[PDB]
Amino acid sequence: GSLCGRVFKVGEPTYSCRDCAVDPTCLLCMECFLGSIHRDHRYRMTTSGGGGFCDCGDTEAWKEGPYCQKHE
């Protein structure tokens, strides 16, 4: 697998899976979120303040489903 690493732009949607995130900072970009198991989980979309990055592909950021279809 690979890391997404997408750097969030100010104002861009970010996705936190409440069921799977290890800590509050664990986030997915829209593309990864919708290609992941988390699309059907309890989640929160928050608009980014800019900076940070998508954590898709980080096995320590997710209790389940660390990769999406693109990055696995």
> Is residue 39 near Zn ion by the rule CB under 5 A?
no
d(CA 3, CA 18): 21
Structure-token match 């900076």, residue found: 51
- What is residue 8's DSSP assignment? P
20 binds Zn ion (CB under 5 A): yes
- Region from 7-15, 32-40, 44-52 binding Zn ion, contact rule CB under 5 A: 32-40
Q: What do you get for the CA distance between the two ends of the chain, in Å?
A: 4
Q: Per CB under 5 A, does 27 bind Zn ion?
A: no
Residues that bind Zn ion (CB under 5 A): 4, 6, 17, 19-20, 29, 32, 38, 41, 54, 56, 68, 70-71
